[PDB]
Design a protein around this ligand. Structure first.
Ligand code: K5A
Ligand code: MG
Lengths: 556, 412
């Protein structure tokens, strides 16, 4: 007998104040009972479960199930109730590596750790909670009662505890073999290296010798898979990676469910297929819960789809990461709040691609969206590669300098260079810091009746120009913007405008270049046409000339 | 210190479960090295999957230090940890500290590693060194001793500290020593030559009781509320008077008695913004009377220790930053302005981050606690970058201002 090391037990507890399950065993046919007795007798011989006396008061139901052609019964212990009552665990990370962060390992072996799993003992103090009962034939004897000694499949803690147990066992082998990589995925242990196949086979043998210290046998995975590996929705080849086939269906009729699957496919594709766009296809889902509601496609959603079909006609691939080369991220503006990017180390050889869509907002501008895209890519790059990329941005250095030195918020973007790839991001207007000499001065105001919703908007100027416009179905805030709009419409290329509207100032000081308000948009279009605009604010109802006059004109 | 002080969470609360944010490779490598040595010294231990808690960790560099340092973000654990009345009912915050001519800040967080943490509480200090690209599971640790940055540590360690210091205090009764989290604030009224000596005499005294060798030098000499000032001009344009009336209208929310009627009178009509208006005598008097009002302190300003301190910050341009600390609006307890932030002439976010730490330092000296910040920055930009410039061992709370305040002009 070769002594083997025990696998360290994880102490397990029920949630505070909760007891173990006490779920009644269902009745089963004579046929299923025979099947379950046979299965459990074999599990018992292998140490997986143990018979127990009648003192244990816990119970979880057991079932017997079949398959279409596989003509034998399967055991199923339903641990849902126990799972509700088991403590939380540090879970197996939901995150998986992104292929573009992987580095070349020419040699890979896949070991099956299915059998090692059953050497992981279940905390002895917890086993009582896993009791189950095989009902007896004709219910004329006591049911056969078992509990688990190993991690039950289907129980809440089994994946985290199995994974942690393997990691701890593998750790010394990994640290003393820095030229190999090891990655576990359920019963699959992937062991890779960039060594000549002979030296690699040796490391694999050394790994097997290591795991034997715990009595673990790990043979190669049945029916060794030829390249590429089909992993987590990717195709991993020795020197390149892509997503698995992206096939967009043809359809006369699209439902809310069909469009969801389409965006998901498109979103999956967008990590390597550059320029994918999903706005017009997502706009068809705004607010609806009926998933069979046939939503006709807009001519803009058809265009978008057709554009994505073109992008998807041919497979593209990414390359793996080379730590010795620089990491570069390039961004393009696509329109309607959409942005695309490529990350690469060599021109024309993308590590991966991606996209970024404008946040929901009343107002926005292109420089803010570009900044947000940069922050997203920055964070994604730190995740994948542990470093910020150098950026190539379609914004002139002088445009950026003007923006951040004058913008009221702090803002930053990391090391970057201009790439002259239209359309370029620009500032569409800039207000003056001081009043303009020789420019006419418009005092603007608007007001509305809260009940009738009737309003007025207008201005008076130092040249005696004046305008008041009656308005229907409006609000104070809206009349205040309308007044500014009228002053812009009716002035020369240089204009001083005086408002008392804190609402209007707050909007314009935010420097939007687009809005969900047509009126704000009309004001932006006027600003773009001016040469110089000074916008000044005064408190309302303080007797300030000009302002007092127009306030009267519009307040009835 | 063999005996551990029992510590619990607040009633009905579980431990923190805060996501670890992604870290650069150089920071990960630094944390691996630091934590390997800490594990060898017994300060932390690897934990298993039965521990589901987490607190974020990152790596910093103290002001002018090339050695990486581990910083655990215990903000969630601290709010979940029982309130402490450790050895008494509380240490009344020393009002004399802010009056000392010089205050030196000493990092004494290393002292915490000599006290063991309550064995039943350790699981709540769990933290993860993350992997790059999710390629390995994070390295999972918990603390065995009092951790730096945790609310419990100064509280549990306070008996040991007061004894370590008593001989020094007995000898220097005029030096104020105040502890906040991992820091000691040592103030006196001597010249830096004697003060440095004392400071070096204190760390030596600390080294003989079981350090760092670093120190920050503050001069809370003139920390006050900066007066509202009005322009003094020989010729006022329409625009100048409009700006003055707006500023006075704002000041009128703070100060009773502010009047603008006579100044508004000057703007009778619909005048060009650049037209020069002569001040009448009535308007000159009104402006002088406002000027006199603004020389007095604001009425009914008092600190209420049961309420949060609020700090607002404005970017003024050209490396200048203004800020106000208050508990209720228009009742400023302190106002200030910073310029030429060190080492960030081209980086807004670095400047803002340094202003946030300076203000927090001032807040600890004056009131013994940190303010909640209203930051003029988009959340995504701040969250991406602030850890890159952080140099303090505490971290305050903050929220984001997305609408430009009209008042930036008035603090201009
Ligand atoms: C080893 C492994 C396999 C799979 C799968 N499925 C997934 C992950 C996450 C794995 O884990 C790691 N993978 C790597 N690199 C990659 C680089 C690209 N290839 C694909 C390939 C190469 C050679 C052959 S071949 N010629 O032998 O047939 C076939 C397929 C696999 C290894 N790096 C790390 C670092 C830490 S974990 C980890
Ligand atoms: Mg009005």
């Amino acid at each position: 007998m070769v002594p083997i090391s025990p696998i360290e037990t994880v102490p397990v507890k029920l949630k505070p104040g909760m007891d173990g399950p006490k779920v009644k065993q269902w009745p089963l046919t004579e046929e299923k009972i025979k099947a379950l007795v046979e299965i459990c007798t074999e599990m018992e011989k292998e140490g997986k479960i143990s018979k127990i006396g009648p003192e244990n008061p816990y119970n979880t139901p057991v079932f017997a199930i079949k398959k279409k052609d596989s003509t034998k019964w399967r055991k199923l212990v339903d641990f849902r109730e126990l799972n509700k009552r088991t403590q939380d665990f540090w879970e197996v990370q939901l995150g998986i590596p992104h292929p573009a962060g992987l580095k070349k390992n020419k040699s890979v072996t896949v070991l099956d750790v299915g059998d090692a799993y059953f050497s992981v003992p279940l905390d002895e103090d917890f086993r009582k909670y896993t009791a189950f009962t095989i009902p007896s034939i004709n219910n004329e004897t006591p049911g056969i009662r078992y509990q688990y000694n190993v991690l039950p499949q289907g129980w809440k803690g089994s994946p985290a505890i199995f994974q942690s147990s393997m990691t701890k066992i593998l750790e010394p082998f990994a640290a003393q073999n820095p030229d190999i990589v090891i990655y576990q995925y359920m019963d699959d242990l992937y062991v890779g290296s960039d060594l000549e196949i002979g030296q690699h086979r040796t490391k694999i043998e050394e790994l097997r010798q290591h795991l034997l210290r715990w009595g673990l046998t790990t043979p190669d995975k049945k029916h060794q898979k030829e390249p590429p590996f089909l992993w987590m929705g990717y195709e991993l080849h020795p020197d390149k990676w892509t997503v698995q086939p992206i096939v967009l269906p043809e359809k006369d009729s699209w439902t809310v469910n069909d469009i969801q699957k389409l965006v998901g496919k498109l979103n999956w594709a967008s990590q390597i297929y550059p320029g994918i766009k999903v706005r017009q296809l997502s706009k068809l889902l705004r607010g609806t819960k009926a998933l069979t509601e046939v939503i006709p496609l807009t001519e803009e959603a058809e265009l978008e789809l057709a554009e994505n079909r073109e992008i998807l006609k041919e497979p593209v691939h990414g390359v793996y990461y080379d730590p010795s080369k620089d990491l570069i991220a390039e961004i393009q503006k696509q329109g309607q709040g959409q942005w695309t990017y490529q990350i690469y180390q060599e021109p024309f050889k993308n590590l991966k691609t991606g996209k970024y869509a404008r946040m929901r907002g009343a107002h926005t501008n292109d420089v803010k969206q570009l900044t947000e895209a940069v922050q997203k890519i920055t964070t994604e790059s730190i995740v994948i590669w542990g470093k910020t990329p150098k950026f190539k941005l379609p914004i002139q250095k002088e445009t950026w300098e003007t923006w951040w030195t004058e913008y009221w918020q702090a803002t930053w973007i990391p090391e970057w260079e201009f790439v002259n790839t239209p359309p370029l991001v620009k500032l569409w207007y800039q207000l003056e810091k001081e009043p303009i000499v020789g420019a006419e001065t418009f005092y603007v105001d608007g007001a509305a009746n809260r009940e009738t919703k009737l309003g007025k908007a207008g201005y008076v100027t130092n040249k005696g120009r004046q305008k008041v416009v009656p308005l229907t179905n409006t609000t104070n805030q809206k009349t205040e913007l309308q007044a500014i709009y009228l002053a812009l419409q009716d002035s020369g290329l240089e204009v001083n405008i005086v408002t008392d509207s804190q609402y209007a100032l707050g909007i314009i000081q935010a420097q939007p270049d687009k809005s969900e308000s047509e009126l704000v948009n009309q004001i932006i279009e006027q600003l773009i046409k001016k040469e110089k605009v000074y916008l000044a604010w005064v408190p309302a109802h303080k007797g300030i000339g000009g302002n007092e006059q127009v306030d009267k004109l519009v307040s009835a | 210190p063999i005996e551990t002080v029992p510590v619990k969470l607040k009633p009905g609360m579980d431990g923190p479960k805060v996501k670890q944010w992604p870290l650069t490779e150089e920071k990960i490598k630094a944390l691996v090295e630091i934590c390997t040595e800490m594990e060898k010294e017994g300060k932390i231990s690897k934990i298993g999957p039965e521990n589901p808690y987490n607190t974020p960790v990152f790596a910093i560099k103290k002001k002018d230090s090339t050695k990486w340092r581990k910083l655990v973000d215990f903000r969630e654990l601290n709010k979940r940890t029982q309130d402490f009345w450790e050895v008494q009912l509380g240490i009344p915050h020393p009002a004399g500290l802010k009056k000392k001519k010089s205050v030196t800040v000493l990092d004494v967080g290393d002292a915490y590693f000599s006290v063991p943490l309550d064995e039943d509480f350790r699981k709540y200090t769990a933290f993860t060194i993350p992997s790059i690209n999710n390629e390995t599971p994070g390295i999972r640790y918990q603390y065995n001793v009092l951790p730096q940055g945790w609310k419990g540590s100064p509280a549990i360690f306070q008996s040991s500290m007061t004894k370590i210091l008593e001989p020094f205090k007995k000898q220097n009764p005029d030096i104020v020593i105040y502890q906040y989290m991992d820091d000691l604030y040592v103030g006196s009224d001597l010249e830096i030559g004697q003060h440095r000596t004392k400071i070096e005499e204190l760390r030596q005294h600390l080294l003989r009781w079981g350090f760092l060798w670093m120190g920050y030098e503050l001069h809370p000499d003139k920390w006050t509320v900066q007066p509202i000032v009005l322009p003094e001009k020989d010729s006022w344009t329409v625009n100048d008077i409009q700006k003055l009336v707006g500023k006075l209208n704002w000041a009128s929310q703070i100060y009773p008695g502010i009047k603008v009627r006579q100044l508004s009178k000057l703007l009778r009509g619909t005048k060009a913004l650049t037209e020069v208006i002569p001040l009448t005598e009535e308007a000159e008097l009104e402006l002088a009377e406002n000027r006199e009002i603004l020389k007095e302190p604001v009425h009914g300003v008092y600190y209420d220790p049961s309420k949060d301190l609020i700090a607002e910050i404005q970017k003024q341009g050209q490396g200048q930053w203004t800020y106000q600390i208050y508990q209720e609006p228009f009742k400023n307890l302190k106002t200030g302005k910073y310029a030429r932030m060190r080492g960030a002439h081209t980086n807004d976010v670095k400047q803002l981050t340094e202003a946030v730490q300076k203000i927090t330092t001032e807040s600890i000296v004056i009131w013994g606690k940190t303010p909640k910040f209203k930051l003029p920055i988009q959340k995504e930009t701040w969250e991406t970058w602030w850890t890159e410039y952080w140099q303090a061992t505490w971290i305050p709370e903050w929220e984001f201002v997305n609408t430009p305040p009209l008042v930036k002009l008035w603090y201009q």
